[PDB]
């Protein structure tokens, strides 16, 4: 078996925000932890306060579904990416788009920012990713080689610097400078829509309807499985304390232990009043910066906030 998993307390829902007019597809938190930002399929970008849950501001520039937002830690910039094939840079001292990155040939499914250099990486449905230069809007590399839409991309400072998962069920680890794939991982049988990197362990995990898998950098050596969540998995998100959240597309959300891979909670939330029951689904989840709150962006146009439960103990909720 295994040593026995660490005990983590369970999480309870405590807030439900509802102001969007279409599915909510992406969510992100500011560096300084005061507000978060959601992008939805009603083509707006709303900016909410993280303490009160009040809505501060609504930015409307896109022409279709906003499928990714991110907030840069080095500059007052928010980068958004839509299904209109366009990638935008909003400057948050005037709240206006100042820069737009052109060249993708179909909807852009996701986007990440490099933590030290000033580049962008975007993945799209033309089955390529691109490395953009933040400052001159010039595409410095087109990472090509997948054979179907590129569902997700994550980038890091260490090496390899870019991990993409795509719908042709493959993961690739790329080098940023050379611009070509070092490793191709074909263990999954179904589309890889979720990838996450451990904050402090040089390992990463990749989610698919088969099962989540863990891999070990820099050449992606298999480590273990995490099975039990049989659902189209849209997100993975890891805490610094080894909690791993796996959000599915039928609404169900499992919480796991990262190290031993032990699923310690299963949340099955409820749909907003006027919703059908075929419209429960999680599209994005994000931990707070204090790693205390867990925000989720759902297919019933709500944002649900979970906080940890403080009044439970190893004997109230034992570890099987």
């Amino acid at each position: 078996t295994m040593p026995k998993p660490q005990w983590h307390p369970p999480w309870k829902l405590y807030r439900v925000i509802s102001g969007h007019l279409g599915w909510v597809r992406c969510i992100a938190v500011e560096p300084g932890n005061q507000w978060f930002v959601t992008g939805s399929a009603d083509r707006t970008i709303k900016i909410w306060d993280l303490a009160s849950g009040k809505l501060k501001l609504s930015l409307t520039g896109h022409i279709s579904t906003v499928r990714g937002v991110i907030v840069s830690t080095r500059s007052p910039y928010l980068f958004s990416c839509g299904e209109d094939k366009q990638v935008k840079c909003w400057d948050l001292e005037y709240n206006k788009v100042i820069r737009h990155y052109h060249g993708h040939l179909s909807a852009v499914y996701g986007l990440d920012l490099h933590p030290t250099i000033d580049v962008l990486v975007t993945c799209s449905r033309d089955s390529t990713a691109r490395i953009w230069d933040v400052r001159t809007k010039a595409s410095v590399h087109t990472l090509s080689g997948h054979t179907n839409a590129v569902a997700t991309v994550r980038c890091q400072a260490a090496e390899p610097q870019i991990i993409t998962g795509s719908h042709d069920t493959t993961i690739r680890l790329w080098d940023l400078v050379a611009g070509k794939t070092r490793v191709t991982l074909t263990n999954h049988k179904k589309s890889v829509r979720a990838v996450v990197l451990h904050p402090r362990h040089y390992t990463f995990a990749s989610g698919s309807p088969d099962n989540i898998k863990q891999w070990k950098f820099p050449d992606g050596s298999f480590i273990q499985n995490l099975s039990g969540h049989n659902a189209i998995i849209n997100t993975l998100t890891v805490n610094s304390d080894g909690v791993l959240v796996s959000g599915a597309d039928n609404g169900t959300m499992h919480l796991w232990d990262w190290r031993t891979g032990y699923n310690f909670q299963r949340v099955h939330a409820a749909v907003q009043p006027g919703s059908l029951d075929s419209e429960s689904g999680i599209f994005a989840c994000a931990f707070d910066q204090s790693e205390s709150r867990l925000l989720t962006a759902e297919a019933d146009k709500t944002i649900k906030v979970y906080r940890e439960d403080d009044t439970a103990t190893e004997e109230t909720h034992p570890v099987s």
């Binding site: 439900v16 102001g19 501001l57 709240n95 749909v271 006027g274």
Partner: protein
């Protein structure tokens, strides 16, 4: 006890679907007009 179609309550209200203690904000139109920067600059 006839409910004019003007009422016709479908859709159990939120407190009944979520619980007695889960909070529920409904945020249509925003505060803080668009001219107000999110990150204020220095002077």
């Amino acid at each position: 006890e006839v409910v004019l179609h003007e009422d016709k309550k479908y859709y159990p209200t939120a407190e009944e679907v979520y619980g007695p203690e889960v909070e529920t904000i409904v945020q249509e139109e925003d505060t803080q007009p668009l001219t107000e920067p999110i990150i204020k600059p220095v002077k």
